[PDB]
Design a protein around this ligand. Structure first.
Ligand SMILES: *Cc1c(COP(=O)(O)O)cnc(C)c1O
Ligand SMILES: *Cc1c(COP(=O)(O)O)cnc(C)c1O
Ligand SMILES: N[C@@H](Cc1ccccc1)C(=O)O
Ligand SMILES: O=C(O)CCCC(=O)C(=O)O
Lengths: 467, 467
């Protein structure tokens, strides 16, 4: 079982990075190099780096935890500065590639053997790789109608067309409306008569950007079976699926439990043949300034993406791979230590969501029926629904209400900024995306949702004007 | 004038990342965010970093030089970890953009006002951006017949055809044979009747990879003048031009005197219109594993390069910008101090090149006339000529001698591995590139040239066979 068929003409056809030696030849057993254009490590200005950490989020400065990064190391699980600040295999340093093979064995084991990982400069990097590796010029990619907008620059670069896939906005939505999704495929010729059959599905199955929704283990089985039947690849994008949130309890967990009953399976777990490419990032779990991530796919998909990175992004920062790999191994003692740090963030992220939602639930705006809120199963985004009258112009009134938000002093992202096709999605655009991740503290969350709901109350009180 | 016309249709065509305020719309003064999917810095497992530096190349274990990176600082010459580990502008952090401008005003002041820098992930990343910003499908790029081979994949990715420009191998040589360069251009339709007029030149003008040649100031004026006449862009690649080398003396400097008299001027110093795009890297001067560099070009070229980054390479590591920005500002006290560290390395690479040449000059292979070396004027590479009888097969006998080089225990790079077009350049392929950047010490240089000379002698003593 292999996905060679799914891999692009463009990506397949890029070349790999010299014969029978003479009869009486043996290599010399310790040779010297006049070959590669590499400054010897003695040239590097950095001798050692001390990385000073925290035991938990929001802690202010038991003594401080420290990882020392020395010029040289014998530990096969650490990266020294001698290799870390030197030229490296583009696919990544071996210790960080291994930490990720194990992390994925622990959290989302692929249902087949011939899989591999590949260090990236983040999710967006990972998506652009996934787009290049699966889309030729003229292909259609299936994109969730409200999506992570940048993806369309990577599909558009690979020359593909984003066909939009309707989201169900019910409080129990999996996200993607399975019925309108089955119809699109069954009746492709009827909907898009002048476009080829879709090549791929770009889905943010868990903590969907920006809707909030998570696809259940039974919904994924169905989508995967649609992937096998109509033979399309799955680009899975999971930057914060590890941040599982329990459903709203009014405000004011061990590794085996989380892994067994809190964390929703990844499409990697359903995949037998390598038609799933998974995109991961250290952005929302460590810091966004790393520009570090990894993808998981079939050995031959990762190979193609290697040849692409050889052209457009020749390696993640080795100093960053060094600082991040050694913090995860020395401080956090590997896979299970990193899940314990991921779980600390869970509680914080968990507490914040519930606060923003309480914030909203006490408002006259919620009580009067003007706004509702989807309860996100994971991540850092809430869908904030605006119950405008049906007959009014969604885009016109949402634009006018955005200026009202900005005048009351609450910035949000409107739904209509996150579409594949604004005409296709205008009627389901009556929503702002809230993110409770950036705030400094609990009082900001409270004040944030006070203003958001105060503004919406004036907007409606005023009869949907700025009066 | 300006180089708007030189910007590729493809690069020009990317979008740069909208309704009228209502009547009396005052924005709120101090507003809150539920907008961006940015974790608050409080979520970052790193609180501070100490970077432990050497003060001269090859030092061992004076209080030791160290730089403290705090979560917060008000110094506008520094980057804290609050900004540095957070989503950042794709062009780079303002302190590091500022150092690059200043570094460049000091060293290679462009000859016009309308230029800018941009943070890259090294020279290979710069050159890809350059290839993209200047070349459409079916465009032609002139490339030195022996070159940095990876460049071809960038040009190939841009849809462009690489025409080779001949190298003169005279010990005299500027590199590019200017006589055959002026011919190619004057009589283009006799040379390549199928192909458009060249869109650009790729030139490693100082310390040419691999040949080692440096173009004089007056030879660059001639190249620049051909560039205005035939209206092509110049992609100037300079990874080691700063490491100027005094001509050979038998072995065993003040900033203003280096700047004023040792450093060969950059095409930037000739450019009046924005024709020139300069590729800088921290690879060879600091460390390769940073994946950090920058480009100098016209404001309109760099905007284009920005929109391309937005697609394929969303910014250098912030953590790496942070460690490099601060090391250079705190420890080295800015531009003049960084040039003082560049001068320390200069002295090393200087002593190394001469030890290598001394080692070659004292051998029977040199003395018998079986080899010769070019005195390079900058960088970390040497053309080692192999005087093969004119009528033997250059490639056949060179692949043979390489096998002999490997059996005697010296790894070198054959020139025939660094061609645009192997058949076009076969007759000038009778040379290996030597690099003295990688050796741990002087002893490794002298033993390196000993093994190189022993084998060329033995191979020549055997009759240009292995034996
Ligand atoms: C935040 C986010 C990203 C950004 O990933 P980077 O590593 O920051 O490029 C990508 N995809 C989704 C769905 C996100 O929410
Ligand atoms: C080493 C080298 C490069 C590569 O730069 P990176 O920053 O390592 O990508 C590019 N051009 C030349 C001429 C080089 O010698
Ligand atoms: N500045 C970010 C933009 C971004 C913000 C938030 C989420 C994702 C992306 C970048 O260059 O990649
Ligand atoms: O490190 C890589 O993957 C590519 C760097 C290419 C290079 O300049 C070199 O070979 O030294």
């Amino acid at each position: 079982s292999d996905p060679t068929h799914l891999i692009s003409k463009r990506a397949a056809g890029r070349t790999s990075v010299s014969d029978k030696p003479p009869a009486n030849f043996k290599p010399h057993e310790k040779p010297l190099a006049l070959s590669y254009g590499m400054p010897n490590h003695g040239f590097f200005p950095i001798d050692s780096i001390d990385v000073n950490l925290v035991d938990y989020p929001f802690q202010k400065i038991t003594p401080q935890s420290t990882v020392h990064i020395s010029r040289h190391t014998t530990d096969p699980k650490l990266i020294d500065l001698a290799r870390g600040l030197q030229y490296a295999a583009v696919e990544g340093h071996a210790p960080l590639l291994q930490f990720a093979r194990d992390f994925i064995i622990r959290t989302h084991k692929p249902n087949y053997d011939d899989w591999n990982v590949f260090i990236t400069t983040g999710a967006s990097d990972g998506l652009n790789k996934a787009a290049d590796v699966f889309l030729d010029d003229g292909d259609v990619i299936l994109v969730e109608e409200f999506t992570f907008s940048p993806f369309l620059r990577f599909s558009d670069n690979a020359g593909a067309k984003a066909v939009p896939v309707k989201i169900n906005f019910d409080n129990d939505s999996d996200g993607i409306d399975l019925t309108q999704f089955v119809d699109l495929l069954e009746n492709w010729e009827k909907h898009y008569p002048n476009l080829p059959k879709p090549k791929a599905l770009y889905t943010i199955a868990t903590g969907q950007n920006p809707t909030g929704f998570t696809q259940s283990l039974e919904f994924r089985k169905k989508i995967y079976d649609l992937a096998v039947k109509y033979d399309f690849a799955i680009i899975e994008d999971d930057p914060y699926g590890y941040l599982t949130l329990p459903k709203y309890e009014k405000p004011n967990l061990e590794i085996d439990d989380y892994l067994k009953n809190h964390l929703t399976p990844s499409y990697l777990e359903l995949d037998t043949t390598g038609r799933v490419l998974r995109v991961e990032t250290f952005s929302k779990l460590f810091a966004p300034g790393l520009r570090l991530g990894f993808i998981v796919g079939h050995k031959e998909v990762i190979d193609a993406v290697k040849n692409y990175s050889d052209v457009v992004n020749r390696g993640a920062s080795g100093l960053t791979q060094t600082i991040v790999n050694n913090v995860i191994q020395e401080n956090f003692k590997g896979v299970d230590g990193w899940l314990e740090w991921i779980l600390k963030m869970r509680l914080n992220y968990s507490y914040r969501k519930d606060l923003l939602l309480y914030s909203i639930f006490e408002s006259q705006a919620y009580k009067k029926g003007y706004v509702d809120v989807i309860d996100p199963k994971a991540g850092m985004f809430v869908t904030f629904k605006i119950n405008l009258p049906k007959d009014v112009d969604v885009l016109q009134k949402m634009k006018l209400l955005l200026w009202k938000l900005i005048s009351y002093g609450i910035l949000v992202v409107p739904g209509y900024n996150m579409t594949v096709d604004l005409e296709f999605s205008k009627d389901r655009s009556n929503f702002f995306r809230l993110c409770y991740a950036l705030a400094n503290n609990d009082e900001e969350i409270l004040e944030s949702g006070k203003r958001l709901t105060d503004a919406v109350y004036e907007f409606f009180s005023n009869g949907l004007e700025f009066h």
